[PDB]
Design an enzyme around this catalytic site. Sequence first.
Site, PDB file in Angstrom:
ATOM      1  CD  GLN A  19      -1.415   0.694   3.583  1.00 61.39           C
ATOM      2  OE1 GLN A  19      -2.007  -0.574   3.964  1.00 61.39           O
ATOM      3  NE2 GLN A  19      -1.957   1.729   4.374  1.00 61.39           N
ATOM      4  CB  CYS A  25      -5.392  -0.001   5.104  1.00 66.89           C
ATOM      5  SG  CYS A  25      -6.303   1.666   6.027  1.00 66.89           S
ATOM      6  CG  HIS A 162      -4.471  -1.430   9.360  1.00 66.85           C
ATOM      7  ND1 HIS A 162      -4.341  -0.948   7.893  1.00 66.85           N
ATOM      8  CD2 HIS A 162      -3.416  -2.525   9.494  1.00 66.85           C
ATOM      9  CE1 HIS A 162      -3.778  -1.573   7.336  1.00 66.85           C
ATOM     10  NE2 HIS A 162      -3.020  -2.418   8.061  1.00 66.85           N
TER      11      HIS A 162
HETATM   12  C1  LIG Z   1      -5.210   2.597   6.557  1.00 62.91           C
HETATM   13  C2  LIG Z   1      -4.368   2.369   7.720  1.00 62.91           C
HETATM   14  S1  LIG Z   1      -2.598   2.291   7.579  1.00 62.91           S
HETATM   15  O1  LIG Z   1      -2.578   3.599   6.872  1.00 62.91           O
HETATM   16  O2  LIG Z   1      -2.267   1.205   6.682  1.00 62.91           O
HETATM   17  C3  LIG Z   1      -2.141   2.128   8.965  1.00 62.91           C
HETATM   18  C4  LIG Z   1      -2.413   1.299   9.728  1.00 62.91           C
HETATM   19  C5  LIG Z   1      -1.972   1.143  11.246  1.00 62.91           C
HETATM   20  C6  LIG Z   1      -1.107   2.143  11.605  1.00 62.91           C
HETATM   21  C7  LIG Z   1      -0.685   3.023  10.624  1.00 62.91           C
HETATM   22  C8  LIG Z   1      -1.364   3.166   9.405  1.00 62.91           C
HETATM   23  C9  LIG Z   1      -6.091   3.687   6.770  1.00 62.91           C
HETATM   24  C10 LIG Z   1      -5.083   5.029   7.600  1.00 62.91           C
HETATM   25  C11 LIG Z   1      -5.976   6.321   7.619  1.00 62.91           C
HETATM   26  C12 LIG Z   1      -5.860   7.266   6.693  1.00 62.91           C
HETATM   27  C13 LIG Z   1      -6.227   8.502   6.802  1.00 62.91           C
HETATM   28  C14 LIG Z   1      -7.154   8.558   7.847  1.00 62.91           C
HETATM   29  C15 LIG Z   1      -7.379   7.874   8.921  1.00 62.91           C
HETATM   30  C16 LIG Z   1      -6.924   6.486   8.865  1.00 62.91           C
HETATM   31  N1  LIG Z   1      -7.305   3.589   7.860  1.00 62.91           N
HETATM   32  C17 LIG Z   1      -8.403   3.667   7.620  1.00 62.91           C
HETATM   33  O3  LIG Z   1      -8.881   4.200   6.221  1.00 62.91           O
HETATM   34  C18 LIG Z   1      -9.565   3.542   8.560  1.00 62.91           C
HETATM   35  C19 LIG Z   1      -9.759   1.979   8.651  1.00 62.91           C
HETATM   36  C20 LIG Z   1     -10.966   1.597   9.252  1.00 62.91           C
HETATM   37  C21 LIG Z   1     -11.319   2.064  10.623  1.00 62.91           C
HETATM   38  C22 LIG Z   1     -12.496   1.612  11.062  1.00 62.91           C
HETATM   39  C23 LIG Z   1     -13.473   0.890  10.284  1.00 62.91           C
HETATM   40  C24 LIG Z   1     -13.098   0.491   9.079  1.00 62.91           C
HETATM   41  C25 LIG Z   1     -11.859   0.825   8.680  1.00 62.91           C
HETATM   42  N2  LIG Z   1     -10.835   3.885   8.023  1.00 62.91           N
HETATM   43  C26 LIG Z   1     -11.276   5.227   8.266  1.00 62.91           C
HETATM   44  O4  LIG Z   1     -10.546   5.954   9.003  1.00 62.91           O
HETATM   45  O5  LIG Z   1     -12.294   5.694   7.686  1.00 62.91           O
HETATM   46  C27 LIG Z   1     -12.864   6.995   7.733  1.00 62.91           C
HETATM   47  C28 LIG Z   1     -13.845   7.235   6.705  1.00 62.91           C
HETATM   48  C29 LIG Z   1     -13.468   7.994   5.589  1.00 62.91           C
HETATM   49  C30 LIG Z   1     -14.144   8.160   4.471  1.00 62.91           C
HETATM   50  C31 LIG Z   1     -15.467   7.966   4.670  1.00 62.91           C
HETATM   51  C32 LIG Z   1     -16.067   7.041   5.879  1.00 62.91           C
HETATM   52  C33 LIG Z   1     -15.249   6.862   6.713  1.00 62.91           C
END
Ligand SMILES: *[C@H](CS(=O)(=O)c1ccccc1)[C@H](Cc1ccccc1)NC(=O)[C@H](Cc1ccccc1)NC(=O)OCc1ccccc1
Length: 215
Positions: A19, A25, A162
């Site tokens: 990624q 993620c 994540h």
């Molecule tokens: C990916 C995780 S990662 O970057 O690989 C990671 C994992 C662990 C440690 C460090 C890095 C992303 C990271 C991220 C990026 C920007 C903002 C927040 C988080 N994680 C997500 O996308 C999360 C994961 C998740 C959480 C709860 C339920 C399902 C999936 N998703 C998320 O934050 O959704 C927010 C959202 C955005 C748009 C529309 C609805 C919800």
Amino acid sequence: APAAVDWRARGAVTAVKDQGQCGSCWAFSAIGNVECQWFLAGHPLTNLSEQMLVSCDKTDSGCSGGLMNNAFEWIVQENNGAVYTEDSYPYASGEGISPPCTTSGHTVGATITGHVELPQDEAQIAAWLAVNGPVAVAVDASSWMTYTGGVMTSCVSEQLDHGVLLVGYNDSAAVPYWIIKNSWTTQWGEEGYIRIAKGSNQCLVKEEASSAVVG
Ligand SMILES: *[C@H](CS(=O)(=O)c1ccccc1)[C@H](Cc1ccccc1)NC(=O)[C@H](Cc1ccccc1)NC(=O)OCc1ccccc1
């Protein structure tokens, strides 16, 4: 149920992906789920397109996060159930900037009709995965940078951040554990996978588990 299931060791999971420096993620999680379910539905094991989701799924935020349940809904409701191949829509967001959505030049590699969200119950999640295959799950991966191998028992579990792929479990071990496919290349963890303890809601793995459905 079988005492231990591992869908990767049965050959139903694609290779561990990369990624990069992008908050994608959720895309890798969801696409990995569609890959396995497509194969398990009587189709060849195909590499499918995270970038389709990253660039075109406007119910999510590309390199700034998303929900695997949102991505499954977008596929059915906005992209006519279609999922493009990785080759025809290749990943291009490894440096944090996703190209704009493109609506030409891409080729279907899988279709889904909907998705099932799973009960917030680890035991029922295990029972589902043993029959229907890998599961897209959200976890608290804050402790995961320091993961090196072994059954992680110290999953600091305060907040979901994540998206990953539950590929199996092993109840026969001294400490039963889940098997999780990550999207951080094979140089991380156990050739790209991680084991967390099973039965105490480690990493909050029960809270948002789901899977695509191939009609
Ligand atoms: C990916 C995780 S990662 O970057 O690989 C990671 C994992 C662990 C440690 C460090 C890095 C992303 C990271 C991220 C990026 C920007 C903002 C927040 C988080 N994680 C997500 O996308 C999360 C994961 C998740 C959480 C709860 C339920 C399902 C999936 N998703 C998320 O934050 O959704 C927010 C959202 C955005 C748009 C529309 C609805 C919800």
